[PDB]
Design a binder for this molecule. Structure first.
Ligand code: HEM
Length: 278
């Protein structure tokens, strides 16, 4: 039955309206697509030292998801969640047109036991970034690198990373290739950041130790990036992709949409090609 009950653009439009009153939840909804995919792949995170696939800071997003599901019953919650992430990209002026046009449906709301992969080294606790990203549907290195431009939007939260009033790149509301340009520009100025225990970050059981920081200007904005994200700039092939995306927005948009689609389809079976229900 090539028969979704609803039009995918209606769900996207309904999520966008929510974002119009809660603009901050667009980027969190995008992060949620990664959280879900990382969890299906066996990489749920406990610490942002590994990735932002932590379960924390998603209450308000779950609020919107519940609204969308009530609004669109008969849809699976997983399908709705992927469309909300896509709506986040749209809201944040990101490239989403191919992702939406090629969107497939039928994601099973399975009741699957959470799994956590175990590193080969007994004294290793965090997985590398390539290990995690490649596993989100079998991504190429180009797709992995393309996906990280989601860090060009959103911000840090006290119950997730343990700090507030910081972003990756100094901006929050445009999802483009500025991420790559930012990393390359400030690569050598990033310094270790100590995240202190405060009365506001108690939800973060173990504060991250690998965060690094630059202050960018007539006031300074605190810009924060994982040491691991920066260390990849030392890898030849990774860096050439960062350099390339910094200069070639068109190429980046293509790879981004291809990666994002693989991610939101990863570890789902029997997804169905979309047909207009009308
Ligand atoms: C795999 C390595 C990754 C690392 C180390 C990492 C690190 C982080 C950190 C520290 C934050 C701040 C979280 C907070 O305090 O709220 C963040 C936020 C965010 N990340 Fe990641 N991340 C990774 C992967 C990804 C991927 C693959 C995506 C998208 C597909 C993504 C999308 C986002 C978005 C949209 C935000 C902002 C969320 C918000 O504003 O609520 N990240 N990331």
């Amino acid at each position: 039955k090539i028969k979704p009950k609803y039009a995918r653009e209606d769900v996207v439009a309904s999520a966008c309206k929510q974002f119009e009153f809660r603009p901050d939840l667009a980027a969190t909804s995008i992060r949620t697509a990664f959280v879900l995919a990382a969890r299906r792949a066996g990489f749920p995170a406990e610490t942002v030292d590994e990735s932002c696939a932590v379960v924390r800071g998603l209450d308000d997003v779950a609020g919107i998801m519940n609204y969308l599901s009530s609004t669109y019953p008969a849809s699976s919650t997983e399908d709705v969640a992927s469309l909300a992430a896509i709506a986040g990209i749209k809201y944040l002026n990101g490239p989403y047109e191919a992702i939406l046009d090629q969107w497939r449906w039928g994601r099973n709301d399975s009741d699957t036991a959470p799994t956590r992969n175990i590193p080969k080294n007994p004294n290793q606790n965090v997985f590398s970034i390539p290990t995690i990203l490649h596993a989100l549907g079998g991504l190429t290195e180009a797709e992995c690198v393309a996906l990280l431009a989601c860090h060009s939007v959103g911000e840090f939260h006290e119950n997730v990373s343990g700090l507030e009033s910081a972003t990756h790149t100094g901006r929050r509301y445009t999802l483009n290739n500025r991420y790559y340009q930012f990393l390359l520009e400030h690569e050598r100025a990033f310094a270790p950041l100590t995240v202190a225990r405060t009365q506001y970050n108690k939800e973060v059981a173990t504060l991250p130790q690998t965060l690094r920081c630059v202050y960018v200007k007539a006031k300074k904005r605190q810009c924060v990036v994982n040491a691991a994200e920066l260390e990849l700039l030392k890898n030849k092939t990774w860096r050439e992709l960062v350099v390339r995306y910094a200069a070639d927005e068109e190429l980046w948009r293509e790879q981004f949409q291809s990666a994002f689609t693989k991610m939101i389809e990863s570890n789902f079976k029997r997804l169905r090609p979309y047909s207009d229900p009308n």
